[PDB]
Amino acid sequence: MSAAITEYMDVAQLTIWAFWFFFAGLIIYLRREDKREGYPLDSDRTERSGGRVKVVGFPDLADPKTFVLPHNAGTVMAPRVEAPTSINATPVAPFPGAPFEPNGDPMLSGFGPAASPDRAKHCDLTFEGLPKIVPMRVATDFSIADKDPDPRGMTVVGLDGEVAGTISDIWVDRSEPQIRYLEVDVSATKKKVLLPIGFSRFDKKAGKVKVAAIKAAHFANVPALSKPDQITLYEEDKVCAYYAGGKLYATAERAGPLL
Amino acid sequence: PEYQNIFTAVQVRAPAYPGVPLPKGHLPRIGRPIFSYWLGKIGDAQIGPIYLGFTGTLSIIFGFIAIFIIGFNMLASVDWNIIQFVKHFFWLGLEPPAPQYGLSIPPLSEGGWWLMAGFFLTMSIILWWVRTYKRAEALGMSQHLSWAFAAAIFFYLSLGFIRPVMMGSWAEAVPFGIFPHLDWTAAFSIRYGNLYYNPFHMLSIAFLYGSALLFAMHGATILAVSRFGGDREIDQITDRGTAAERAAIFWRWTMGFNASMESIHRWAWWCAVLTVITAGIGILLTGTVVENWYLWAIKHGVAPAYPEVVTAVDPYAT
Amino acid sequence: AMLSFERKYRVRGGTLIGGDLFDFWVGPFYVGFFGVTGFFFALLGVLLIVWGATIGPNAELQTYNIWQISIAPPDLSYGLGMAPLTEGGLWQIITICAIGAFVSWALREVEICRKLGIGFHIPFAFAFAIGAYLVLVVVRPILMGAWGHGFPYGILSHLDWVSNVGYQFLHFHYNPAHMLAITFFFTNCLALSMHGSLILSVTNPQKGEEVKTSEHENTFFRDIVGYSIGALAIHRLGLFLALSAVFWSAVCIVISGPFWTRGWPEWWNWWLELPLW
Amino acid sequence: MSPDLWKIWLLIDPRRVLIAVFAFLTILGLAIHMILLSTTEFNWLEDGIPA
Amino acid sequence: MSPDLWKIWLLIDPRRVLIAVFAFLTILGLAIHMILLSTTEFNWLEDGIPAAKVQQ
Amino acid sequence: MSPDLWKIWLLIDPRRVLIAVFAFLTILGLAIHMILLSTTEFNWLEDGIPAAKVQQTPVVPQR
Amino acid sequence: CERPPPEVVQKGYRGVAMEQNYNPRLLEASLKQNLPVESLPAAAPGGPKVSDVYQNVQVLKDLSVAEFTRTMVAVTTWVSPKEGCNYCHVPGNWASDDIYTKVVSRRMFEMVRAANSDWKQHVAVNGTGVTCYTCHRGNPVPKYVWVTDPGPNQPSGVKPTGQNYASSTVAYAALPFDPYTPFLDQTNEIRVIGQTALPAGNTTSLKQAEWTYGLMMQISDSLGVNCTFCHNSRAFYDWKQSTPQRTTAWYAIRHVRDINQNYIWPLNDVLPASRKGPYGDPFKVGCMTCHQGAYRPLYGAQMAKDYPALYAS
Amino acid sequence: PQQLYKIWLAFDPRMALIGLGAFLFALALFIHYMLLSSPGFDWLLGPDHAPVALSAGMSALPAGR
Ligand code: BCL
Ligand code: BCL
Ligand SMILES: CC[C@H]1c2cc3[nH]c4c(c3C)C(=O)[C@H](C(=O)OC)c4c3nc(cc4[nH]c(cc(n2)[C@@H]1C)c(C(C)=O)c4C)[C@@H](C)[C@@H]3CCC(=O)OC/C=C(\C)CCC[C@H](C)CCC[C@H](C)CCCC(C)C
Ligand SMILES: CC[C@H]1c2cc3[nH]c4c(c3C)C(=O)[C@H](C(=O)OC)c4c3nc(cc4[nH]c(cc(n2)[C@@H]1C)c(C(C)=O)c4C)[C@@H](C)[C@@H]3CCC(=O)OC/C=C(\C)CCC[C@H](C)CCC[C@H](C)CCCC(C)C
Ligand SMILES: COC(C)(C)C/C=C/C(C)=C/C=C/C(C)=C/C=C/C(C)=C/C=C\C=C(C)\C=C\C=C(C)\C=C\C=C(C)\C=C\CC(C)(C)OC
Ligand code: HEC
Ligand SMILES: [Ca+2]
Ligand SMILES: [Ca+2]
Ligand SMILES: [Ca+2]
Ligand SMILES: [Fe+3]
Ligand SMILES: [Mg+2]
C-alpha cells in the first residue's frame, strides 16, 4: 500500500486515465440524448439509396422515451416518426447545398423565416384546467401596475411610421402574470389581429407602439383565431411566424447585401 | 432599437399566489407576499411566502451558533474595540489549531473554537441538504438538485475535514476569514509546488470555463428566440415549436452539430457538477500520493523546457 | 446534413457581403463569404503553429510533445516594431490570423441569424470574449510599450506566463476587480446548476406521474428560498452573470501594470488611512 | 418648546419609531460598553482591583 | 432672511426631511466622535488624565 | 445675469434641483474636510498647536 | 491609480514574464531621497604616526594623523552633524571613555570594517562598499530599525496568533507580521518545499509556508522589487532556474544574522532604555536599514573607496 | 466640390451633429492623453522640470539581459 505502482506508474496517473474513460462514456451518453429530435437525417444519401441507408451518424439512436401530459392530454414519444412534407420553394441551383427560392409571394409562402411546423390544436392549460393565455376582458382580477402607461388606446404605427390601428385589448397569462399579446383593431378591414410583444416597441413618451417587422399595409393578412377568448398552440405559432417573415421579406433592401 | 427583452416595459399585477397545495401533515407557509416594482423590471415581482419545517429550524439554529462563534472570536482578536473591528474586518479571522496538536482538542484560544464552529456549520449544511431533498419530494419532483448539492458538500468536506484527517493534523484546514482564506489558498499552492501542474486542477478549470460558456450560449439562445415563445421551455419540450427548431438549426449551421431543448439542460447539469467532483479529488491526491506537482509533471513529460539564459549558483551544493 | 425539419429554412438571401457568390452549404455548415475567409485564416494559423513546432526553440529542445510545444513573442527590446520571423515574428503573424478568424466567425453568425429571422444576442455575447482576447494581446501590450507582453502560444507555457505575471504583484488575490470577477464566475456556476436541475426534475417526474406544470417551478424555489425569478428571467440573469465575469476580468488584467505598478495589498491603504480610525 | 409638539405623532408611525429607538438604544449601549472594555483605565474586569 | 421662506414645505415632503435629518445628524455625531477618538491629543479615555489607577 | 433668467424654472422643477443641491454641498464639504485632515500641513487636530499637555514607553519602529 | 507607461527591465527568457516595472514619477521621487554626499579631499601622505601621538586608539591603529583627523571629520558629518563632536567625546579632553556613545561607535567601526572585508560576496560585487552614512543618513539613530513586535493588545486569557491583522511589515497582507525574529535574528529553516515527486518524509506544515511568505514580502518591500527579481514562480525551489541575485540574497541573510548576533546584542548593556523594545531587546538591523526601498543602497553610489579607514587592511 | 449641399439629402443632420461632436471630443481626449504619455511634451511636470543627476556610479534602473 504505497503511491508507486511501478518504476514509472503512480496513483495520480491511473486516476486520470480512469477519469478519461468515464468522460468518454459520458460524452457518448450526452450525444445519444442529443439525437431524440430530428433524426434520422434527411440527405441525398438516403434518397439515392431508395430509402435504404439511414443517416444517423455515431452513436445511433436510443429507445423511445414516454412523456405523459397532464389533464389527460395524451402521451408523446421523445424519438418519434413524422410525416415528410413538400416545401413551398424551388432550388436555385441543382448542385447539393444550394439555397431555395421562396416561390410565390414571400410573405404568404410559409417558407424561410416565415415557416412553422403544425403543433397540437389544443390550448395550453393551467394547474386547474383553464386556458392559459386569455384576454383581460375575462381575467378581470388582473390589473396594470401603477405609474405605468397602460397601453390601451395607443396608436400602432407600421415599419414606415404610418398608423395601422389602435390597441383594443391585452392578452395576459394566468399562471405567470405578464403580457403575451396585444390586440390591434385594424382600420383597413374592420378586423382584429394579434401582435406578439417581442415584435413591438413601447414609445412611452408620445404613447406609441412601433412594429419594425411588417409595414402598415401588411396588418391585413395576419392569421386569425378560431374563437375570440382563447388561442391554441397551432395558431400562436402561425401568428408569430407571419411576423417573423417580415424581417426578411418586408422591403427590397432587406435581402442584402451591404456591398 | 428592436425590443431586446432585457427589461419589462409594462407590468401587470394579479393577486398573490399561495402555491400548489401541500399534502396532509405539513405546516402552513409563513408570511404574506408583497410586490416590488423595481424588482419586477428584471424578473417576478413577488416575494414570499416561505416554508419552514423542523429541518429548516434546526439548520437555522446550528448555522447561527456557528456564525456567532466566528464573529465573537473576530471581535476578541482586536481586544473588544468595535471601531478597530470595522477598520480591520476584512483582515480578521478565526484560525485552525497549531500543527503541534495533531487531531487532538486544544484549548479554546488555541483552536477549540475553530473546531466547534466547523462542527456546527457542517451540521447546518447537512440539515439544509435534507431540507432540499424533502421539499423536492413533497411536490412529486425528482432529486437532481439534491445530487448537485451533494457534490458541492463532498468538495466542501474534502476541503475541510477528510484531508486533514488523512494528513493527521488540523493545521492543514482553512481559516474562517476573507483575506485569511485567500492567504491559505496561496500558501497551499506554494507549499505543494505550483498547483497549475495538477491535472485535476486543469480539468476543474476547464469545466468552470465551460460552465460560463454554456450559460452564455444558452441564455443568448433563449433570449434570441423568445419572440416565438421560446422561454416556455416545458411546452417546447413536450411539443416542439418554431423556437426549438430555430435554436437547433442556428447551432447546426454554425458548428455542425446541435442539442435539443430537453438535452441542453443535461449538458448544463453535468458541466457544473464535474467542476466540484474533479476539485474534491484534486486536493485528496495532494500531499497524500504526490509531493511536488512540478516534479511529477517533469517525470511524466508535461512541463516545457526553456533555453538557459539566466541561472544561479547553489550555495548548498558547493 | 439536414435535420428532418430543416429543409423549410434553407432560404436564399440575408448575406452581408457576397450575395449569391458564396451562398451555399457545405455538409451541415453554412459558409458564405466570411466562412471562406475564416476557414482559410484558421488553416494558415494552424500550419504556421505546426511549422513553429517543427523549428522549435532550438535544434536541441525541439519536440513534438503536445504539452511542450510553445511559440513565443518577441523581446522587449523590439518595442512595437516588427521582429524577424525566427525571433518572434511568427507569433505576430499567428496573432493576426487568429484575430481575422474570430471576426470572420462572428460575422458569419450575424449572417446566419439574419437568415433565420432571430435576434442578435449570440454574436453580441461572443464579442465580449473576443474583446477579452484583444485586451490580452493588443491593448495591454500597446499601453505597456512592447509586443513582448503578450502570452506565448502553448498548452503549458501560457500557464507559466499567467503564474509569473500574477507574482509580479506579490499577491494577486488582493486585486479588487479580480475578486469581483471571481464572485461572478462562482455565482454563474451555481445558477447554471440550479437551472439544469429544476428543468430536469420537472421534465422527469417520479414514476407513475405526469409532467409538472409552470406553477411547480415557482412553488419549489419559493418554498426553498422564498423567491422565484421566472422562466425568462433565469436566462436573462445567466447571460448577465456570464458577461459581467468577463468584463471585470478584462478590467482586472488591464489595470495590472499600466495603471498600478506596486503590490496589490498596498492598494487598500486608502481604506486603512482614513481619519475615522 | 411650544406645547403643540404632540402633533409629531400624526406625521410618523408610532410603532416604527418605537422599534427603531429600542434597537438604536440597545446597539448604542453595547457599543459604549465594548469601547470602555477596550481601554486599560476603564476595564473593570482586568483592572486587578480589588486584588 | 426672507419672510416668505415657509413656502419650502409646499415643495418637499416634511415626513421625509424629518427622517433624513435625524439619521444624518446621528451619523455625523458618531463620525465626529470616532475622529476625535482616533487621535492621541483628544482621546479623553486614553489620555491619562486624571491619573491612572491601572498598570500598563 | 439677464433679467429674464427666472424662466429657467420653466424647464427644471424646484424639487429635483433643491434635493440635488442640498445632497451635493454636504458631500463636497465632507470631502474637502477629509482632504484637509489627510495632509500634515492643514490638519488642525494633530498640528501640535497649541502645545500638547498629553504625554507621549518602548515603541515599535517597524510600523 | 497611476498613468502609463512604466519603465520595464526584462530578466528572463521571452514569454516567461520575469520583468520589473517602475513608475517614472515614483522613481524620480524615490531617487530624490537617496542622494550621496561629496567626499572630503585626500589627506597629505606622510608625517607623524597615530601610535605615537595618541593613547587610547584601539581600532584605527595603523593610520596616519592626517588620515585619522580626516576620518573623524567625515564621521562627524555622517552621524551627528547637529551636535558636532561633543556627541561622542566628553568635553575637556579626548582620551576619556566615560560615555556610552564612544564605546558604541568603537564597536560600529569594527562592524563596518568587517562588513567591507569578510562579506565581499554581498557588499562588494560592484565595489559599492559600506560606510557609516549607509544606515544613519545623517541621523544619530537610524530610521529603519526593528524590534520584537508584540502585536495588537489581546484579552488576558487569549493566546495571540501573530497574524490576521493588517500590517505594513508584510506590505499590508494578512500574513504573520513579525518575520524578523525567527529568521533575521534566530536561525530557522526557510525552505518548505519538497524535492521529490512522491512523498518521502517531508512533514513541514502548511502554516510554515505562510511565515516564509511573510519574510519574502518583507524582503521584496525592502528592496523595492517583486518575486521574479530572484525566482521563476513555476519552481521557487529550483536554483537552476533562478537569477544570480538569489545567491547574493542567500549570503545577505547570513550577513545580517552575523551583524545582529555578534555586534548589536552584546551592546544591550550600555545602551539607554530609550533604544529598546517592549521585550527589552535593542534596535536591530534588517534589509530595510541599508537598502531603504532601493535594489542597492543609494542606488549604488560609491563613497566607501575614498576612505581607507573603513577597511580591515 | 460645388454641389455638396446634396450630402445632407442622404444623411440626417440631427444624428450627424451628435456623431461629429462625440468623435471630435474623443479625438481631443486621445491626443491629449498621447501627449501626456510622451516624454517630450508633458506640461504637468512643470516649466522648471529638473531631473535628478547621478553624481557617482549610480543607476536608477537595475540591469537586465
Ligand atoms: C498566481 C496567479 C494568480 C492569478 C493571476 C491571473 C492572471 C495574469 C490572469 C488571471 C485571470 C483570471 N483569473 Mg486569476 N489568478 C489567481 C487565482 C485565481 C483563482 C483562484 C481559485 O485562486 C480563480 C478562480 C481565478 C480566476 C481568474 C478569472 C477571473 C480570470 C480568468 C478568466 C478569464 O479571463 O476569461 C477570459 C476568456 C477568454 C480570454 C477566452 C477567449 C477565447 C476566444 C473566444 C478565442 C476562441 C478560442 C479558440 C481559438 C476556439 C477554437 C478552439 C478549438 C479549435 C475548438 N484566478 C492567482 C492568485 N489570473 C485572467 C484574466 O483576468 O484575463 C482577462 C488573467 O490574465
Ligand atoms: C471633546 C469630546 C467630548 C464630547 C464633546 C461634545 C460636544 C461639543 C458635543 C457633544 C455632543 C454629544 N455627545 Mg459628546 N463628547 C464627549 C464624550 C461623549 C460620550 C462619552 C462616552 O464619553 C458620549 C456618550 C457622548 C455623546 C454625545 C451626545 C449626547 C451628543 C451628540 C448627540 C447626537 O449624536 O445627535 C444626533 C441626533 C439628533 C440630533 C436627533 C435630534 C434630536 C432632537 C430632534 C432634538 C433634541 C430633543 C431630544 C432628543 C430630547 C430633549 C432634549 C432637549 C433639547 C433638552 N459624548 C467627550 C467628553 N460632545 C453634542 C451635543 O451637545 O448634542 C446635544 C455636542 O455639541
Ligand atoms: C455545482 C457546484 C456549485 C454549487 C451548487 C449548489 N449550491 C447550492 C446548491 C447547489 C446545487 C443548493 O441546493 C443550495 C441551495 O440552497 O441553493 C439555493 C446551495 C447553496 N450554496 C450556497 C453557497 C455557496 N455555493 C457556492 C458554490 C457552488 N455551489 C458551486 C460553484 C459557494 C462558493 C463558490 O463559495 C457558496 C458560498 C448557499 C447559499 C446554499 C446552501 C445554504 C446552506 O446550506 O446553508 C446552511 C446554513 C445556514 C442556512 C445557516 C444560517 C444561519 C442563520 C440564518 C445566520 C444568521 C445571521 C445572518 C447570516 C446575518 C446576516 C443577515 C441575514 C438576513 C442574511
Ligand atoms: C464571453 C462569455 C464566455 C464565452 C462565450 C461564447 N463563446 C463562444 C460563443 C459565445 C457566446 C460563440 O458563439 C462561439 C461558438 O461558436 O460557440 C460554439 C464561441 C466559442 N468559444 C470558443 C472557445 C472558448 N470560449 C471561452 C470563453 C468564453 N466564451 C466566455 C467564458 C474559452 C476560454 C475561457 O478559454 C474558450 C477556449 C470556441 C469553441 C468558439 C469560437 C470558435 C471560433 O472562433 O472559431 C474560429 C477559429 C478557429 C476555428 C481556429 C482559429 C485559428 C487560430 C490560429 C487558433 C489558435 C489561436 C491562439 C491565439 C493560439 C493558441 C492558444 C494557446 C493557449 C493554445
Ligand atoms: C452581528 O453579528 C454577530 C456579531 C452576531 C455575528 C457576526 C459574525 C460575523 C461578522 C462573521 C463573519 C464571518 C466570515 C467573514 C466568515 C468567512 C468564512 C469563510 C470565507 C470560510 C471559508 C472556508 C472555510 C472552510 C472551508 C472551513 C471548513 C471547515 C470544516 C469543513 C471543518 C469541519 C470540522 C469538523 C466536522 C470537526 C470535527 C471535530 C470535532 C467534532 C471534535 O470538533 C468539536
Ligand atoms: C560608522 C562607522 C558608524 C558609526 C560611527 C555609528 N554607526 Fe550605528 N547603529 C546602527 C544601529 C541599528 C544602531 C542602534 C540604534 C541606536 O542605538 O540608535 C546604531 C547605533 C549607533 C550609535 C549609538 C547612537 C545612540 O543611540 O546613542 C552610534 C554612536 C553609532 N551607531 C555610530 C546601525 C548601523 C549600521 C547598519 C548596519 C551601520 C553601517 C552603522 N550603524 C555604522 C555606524
Ligand atoms: Ca475590578
Ligand atoms: Ca481623560
Ligand atoms: Ca491645532
Ligand atoms: Fe433553459
Ligand atoms: Mg493564516
Author numbering:
A (entry chain H): 1 to 259
B (entry chain M): 1 to 318
C (entry chain L): 1 to 277
D (entry chain U): 1 to 51
E (entry chain W): 1 to 56
F (entry chain Y): 1 to 56, 58 to 64
G (entry chain C): 23 to 335
H (entry chain 3): 2 to 66
Give the text the authors published on this PDB structure.
The core light-harvesting (LH1) complex from A. tepidum exhibits an absorption maximum at 890 nm and mildly enhanced thermostability, both of which are Ca2+-dependent. Here, we present a cryo-EM structure of the reaction center–associated LH1 complex at 2.81 Å resolution, in which we identify multiple pigment-binding α- and β-polypeptides within an LH1 ring. The A. tepidum LH1 forms a closed, slightly elliptical ring structure composed of 16 pairs of helical α(inner)β(outer)-polypeptides, 32 BChls a, and 16 all-trans spirilloxanthins that are uniformly distributed around the RC. The RC has a tetraheme-cytochrome subunit and contains four BChls a, two bacteriopheophytins a, one 15-cis-spirilloxanthin, a menaquinone (MQ)-8 at the QA site, and a ubiquinone (UQ)-8 at the QB site.
Due to relatively low sequence similarities, we were able to distinguish all three forms of the α-polypeptides in the A. tepidum LH1 from the cryo-EM density map: six α1, nine α2, and one α3. Only α1-polypeptides bind Ca ions using their mainchain oxygen atoms of Trp44 and Ile49 and sidechain carboxyl group of Asp47 as ligands. This WxxDxI Ca2+-binding motif is not present in the A. tepidum LH1 α2- and α3-polypeptides. Superpositions of the α1-polypeptide with α2- and α3-polypeptides revealed that the C-terminus of the shortest α2-polypeptide would disrupt the Ca-binding site while the longest α3-polypeptide adopted a different conformation from that of the α1-polypeptide around the Ca-binding site. As a result, both α2- and α3-polypeptides are unable to bind Ca2+. The α1-polypeptides of A. tepidum form face-to-face dimeric subunits specifically with β3-polypeptides whereas α2-polypeptides specifically pair with β1-polypeptides, indicating a mechanism of molecular recognition between the polypeptide chains. The arrangement is characterized by specific interactions between the shortest LH1 α2-polypeptides and the RC L- and M-subunits in the transmembrane region. Although A. tepidum LH1 α1- and α3-polypeptides have no significant interactions with the RC subunits in the transmembrane region, these polypeptides have longer chain lengths and are able to interact with the RC C-subunit through their membrane-extruded C-terminal regions. The C-terminal domain of the α3-polypeptide is deeply entangled with the membrane-extruded N- and C-terminal regions of the C-subunit. The partially Ca2+-bound structure of the A. tepidum LH1 well explains its intermediate properties in terms of thermostability, spectroscopy, and phototrophic growth compared with the fully Ca2+-bound LH1 of the thermophilic T. tepidum and the Ca2+-free LH1 of the mesophilic A. vinosum.
